[PDB]
Amino acid sequence: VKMGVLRIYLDGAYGIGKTTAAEEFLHHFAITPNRILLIGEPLSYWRNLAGEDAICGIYGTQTRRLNGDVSPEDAQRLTAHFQSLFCSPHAIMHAKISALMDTSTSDLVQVNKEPYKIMLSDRHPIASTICFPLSRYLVGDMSPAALPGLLFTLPAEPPGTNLVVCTVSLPSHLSRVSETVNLPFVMVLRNVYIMLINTIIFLKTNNWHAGWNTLSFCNDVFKQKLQKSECIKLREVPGIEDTLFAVLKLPELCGEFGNILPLWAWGMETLSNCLRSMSPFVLSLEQTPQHAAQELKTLLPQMTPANMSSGAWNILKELVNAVQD
Amino acid sequence: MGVLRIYLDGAYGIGKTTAAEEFLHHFAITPNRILLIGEPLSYWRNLAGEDAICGIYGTQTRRLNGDVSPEDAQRLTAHFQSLFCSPHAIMHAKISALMDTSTEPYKIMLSDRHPIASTICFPLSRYLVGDMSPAALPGLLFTLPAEPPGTNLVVCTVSLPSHLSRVSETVNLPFVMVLRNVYIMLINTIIFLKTNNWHAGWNTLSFCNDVFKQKLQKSECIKLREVPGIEDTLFAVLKLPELCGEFGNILPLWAWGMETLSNCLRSMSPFVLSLEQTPQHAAQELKTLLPQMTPANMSSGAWNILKELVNAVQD
Ligand SMILES: Nc1ncnc2c1ncn2[C@@H]1O[C@H](COP(=O)(O)OP(=O)(O)O)[C@@H](O)[C@H]1O
Ligand SMILES: O=c1[nH]c(=O)n([C@H]2C[C@H](O)[C@@H](COP(=O)(O)O)O2)cc1/C=C/Br
Ligand SMILES: O=c1[nH]c(=O)n([C@H]2C[C@H](O)[C@@H](COP(=O)(O)O)O2)cc1/C=C/Br
């Protein structure tokens, strides 16, 4: 009864327009209703996650830090708290979906006439568990203490994840927004995502323990560049220093001799395991939503497909519709 | 070959460690027959920079002195409490990978506390006592990973007046009284889950109110019972208005969450061990239980590996 689907997670910085451009893609291809399934960001839960408003809280906390209404040491812990709120929703979902995914190691008895059903999603779990938390650290708004809980506890990623990092020119990104507009965080966020990509590619060939002992620890000088120049350049064959491991080499995770502590190592392993499965793609949103979406279309043929029960797709759809409700 | 995964939990200060060790010294006559994994204090006391333990307690002291808003003190707590998760999880997740899921004296690998202690028992106790905001429950309860078959949860128990001497960190009835209660519920929940679905008498479960919380901090009510009912479980504590909508229905995602939370707890094989006596007895009793526990299968090779890893981090 099988049929191949196309899991596509659309990520990148915020305010860039990856949503009004992800929707304009649904209108001009969903000519046939059952050929595409969209899953939007769960604001409804973020803005009322068991009582607190993750969004307001993550920003308000910074405003509260500047006014000195709270200790900078607490403001960091306080941040970690809110930042973490974004995790659950996206995770409950992703975890369910991985369950409806057919991981059949076998030959095909029959083929399906129809084209592959593409299920588009707004942001991938790593955004909450790795991209943002890491950007907060780099900018100094959050304490590293919360990285293990998010980076090292990642669940096995099922084959076929297509991560599409959206990108916009810098001066244009600063208009799509004007929540708070401060270069430091943005400049970093953009950078991090670029690293993410380099990390995925990197991980495709080499192990995380590559030039680890050749990776200078993460210092304030490094963080400074990340908040100013948007350095980190996306490159053909990435090296350890063009990845996220450049940001993970932290004294707080290593011991006396300067070795990354045992557990934390095992963690790097799973974090690698996850990112490595992914199929990285970059999509420019520097133009009319029409183009952005058209471009995304040209990529469909390059993405890695996965298999799932025809029945399940119909179920998934209902669930997705049951919660985006 | 077949191993015996045994996780030893319960309240703190009770002595489940000096009694879990006295069990290793007596039956490890043959070296390769038993493997112990102790609590990773070394990481808790320096988890990427902060000392989870001091922070969870100090935050309370800081709350009483009014050095910080009670609203922040709650969020601040959630933060630290969460720190306890990673270590235990990195481990457990690795171990699940070395477990053979393929369709004479078995090697028993004893562990100090099971991940649910950090992700469900303690966080929940903090809530009930009012030291933590519910906002952090979904992140810990609903994101639980598939538990592999063969988990033997052994909840240790001590008499009340005796428990208050094993400790005297901070000694305050409210939290203890609750912690004891919660663990009892956990057990009742596991059993309960064996037969019925979480959506049983859900619509007959009164929401969680302050009156309820009050009893949980005073009488150690919650009694362990043969055939548990919805109200003797943890679901009695999970029915929260903050998780339900207007009409009073538990919101979609949170439901799916309950599902996975149930999925986990249900796999477990619950056992109660009394530490109200000489460590010798405590351990001897635990031995009598070995034959009742559910065994799992793993590569002989893996066991040797696991051992090395365990030894590699328990140094
Ligand atoms: N069965 C017992 N009888 C008397 N004292 C005990 C017993 N078990 C433990 N203790 C004492 O109480 C203290 C706390 O117990 P511990 O083993 O550390 O508990 P836990 O496993 O909860 O951390 C120990 O340092 C020990 O001296
Ligand atoms: O981890 C996060 N942290 C965060 O602060 N945010 C923030 C970023 C932004 O203000 C808002 C989400 O809106 P858009 O990203 O669609 O513009 O929440 C988002 C995530 C990620 C969720 Br997965
Ligand atoms: O989640 C937790 N939260 C917590 O505060 N603690 C606390 C409880 C205790 O002070 C200390 C651990 O010592 P024992 O439990 O062995 O006596 O950390 C522990 C856990 C659980 C880890 Br899994």
UniProtKB/Swiss-Prot annotation, chain A:
Disulfide linkage: none
Family annotation (InterPro entries): Herpes_TK (IPR001889), P-loop_NTPase (IPR027417)
Protein EC: 2.7.1.21
Catalytic residue positions: 41 (proton acceptor)
Gene3D superfamilies in the record: P-loop containing nucleotide triphosphate hydrolases (3.40.50.300)
Pfam family, one: Herpes_TK
List of residues binding substrate: 59, 83
Record: residues binding ATP: 12-19, 176
GO BP terms: DNA biosynthetic process; TMP biosynthetic process
Enzyme type, top EC level: transferase
Catalytic activity field: thymidine + ATP = dTMP + ADP + H(+)
UniProt-recorded Gene Ontology molecular function terms: ATP binding; thymidine kinase activity
More details: Phosphorylates and thereby activates certain drugs like acyclovir (ACV), valacyclovir, and famciclovir to a toxic form, that leads to successful suppression of the infection, while the uninfected cell does not have this ability because it lacks TK. Mutations in thymidine kinase may induce HSV resistance to antiviral therapies in immunocompromised patients. The most frequently observed resistant strains are unable to express TK and are avirulent in animal models of disease.
Subunit relationships: Homodimer.
Primary role: Catalyzes the transfer of the gamma-phospho group of ATP to thymidine to generate dTMP in the salvage pathway of pyrimidine synthesis. The dTMP serves as a substrate for DNA polymerase during viral DNA replication. Allows the virus to be reactivated and to grow in non-proliferative cells lacking a high concentration of phosphorylated nucleic acid precursors.
Sequence similarity: Belongs to the herpesviridae thymidine kinase family.
Protein name (database record): Thymidine kinase
High-level lineage: Viruses, Duplodnaviria, Heunggongvirae, Peploviricota, Herviviricetes
